[PDB]
Amino acid sequence: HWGYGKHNGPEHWHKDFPIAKGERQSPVDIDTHTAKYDPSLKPLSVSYDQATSLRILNNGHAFNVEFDDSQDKAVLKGGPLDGTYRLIQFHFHWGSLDGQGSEHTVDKKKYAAELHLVHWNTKYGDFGKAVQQPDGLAILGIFLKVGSAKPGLQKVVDVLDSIKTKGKSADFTNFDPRGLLPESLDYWTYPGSLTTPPLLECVTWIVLKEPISVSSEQVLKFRKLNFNGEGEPEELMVDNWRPAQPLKNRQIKASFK
Ligand SMILES: [Zn+2]
């Protein structure tokens, strides 16, 4: 019964998921004055030309745009990574107000939202196997600010009415996730965790510095989603973000000078 409400939010998760207080939890604050350029990092390789989106699902915590991950169709390689990571889904975290919503922060700045493109290491065969490994996942995080519209997001926005409530899904084929990327692939990277239960410490985080812009109308439509199921009391799906966690014995590395 974890969530983001008044009595089951992030500060409670440790009772059922004790790793919530672990050594490698996410998100974190990215201090641009202490993150160090690492000349051994490589350019990110994002290969999404062959991506097969399938479906969009309201899971009661966010919505996931799901991809066919049964071949190397949409892969992330390079950067900090060894090997090949397959795109399985993307989702967002967002706020009730434009001044909040992101999970990572940059010098304590919260963005209006944050996109997570989740990929699993093909060395481990299936997602469920991958999340049990310290290098099982690579998550590409992208900040959203409110300004201009993002044209490549509109098809997502326009399907949200069909998945208003928890447990609803809709066909969602032929969506191109390249339309959600900023111009630059400059990034920060560090080792961390899933930001939702089970909070497993299986992620290489790759957080892009350049945000994307979405319009106020686009974010307003996200804020019309519901955490609840159909026929239940309406609880708007807003503020579905975990706050920054202690960095502990980690370093954040920058791909750029
Ligand atoms: Zn996420």
Swiss-Prot record:
Q: What is the effect of changing N59L?
A: Reduced activity
**Outcome of mutating A62S, per the record?**
2-fold decrease in enzyme efficiency, as determined by kcat/KM ratio, and efficiently inhibited by chlorzolamide
Its annotated compartments are: Cytoplasm; Cell membrane
**Record note on cofactor:** Zinc. Can also use cobalt(II) with lower efficiency, but not copper(II), nickel(II) and manganese(II).
Taxonomy, superkingdom:
Eukaryota
In terms of SMART domains, this protein maps to: Carb_anhydrase
| Enzyme Commission number | 4.2.1.1, 4.2.1.69
Q: Does the keyword Cytoplasm apply?
A: yes
Q: What else is known?
A: Target of drugs used in treatments against glaucoma disorder and breast cancer.
Phenotype when changing Q89P: In OPTB3; in Czechoslovakia
Q: What is the effect of changing L194 to E/H/R?
A: Strongly reduced CO(2) hydrase activity
One of the GO BP terms on file: regulation of monoatomic anion transport
**What result follows from mutating N64L?**
Reduced activity
**Signal peptide limits:** none
Sorted alphabetically, the Gene Ontology cellular component annotations on this record are: apical part of cell; cytoplasm; cytosol; extracellular exosome; myelin sheath; plasma membrane
Q: So what does mutating H91Y actually do?
A: In OPTB3; partial loss of activity
Catalytic residue positions: H61 (proton donor/acceptor)
Q: What is this protein called?
A: Carbonic anhydrase 2
For the site labelled Involved in the binding of some activators, including histamine and L-histidine, the residues are Q89
What is the similarity comment for this entry?
Answer: Belongs to the alpha-carbonic anhydrase family.
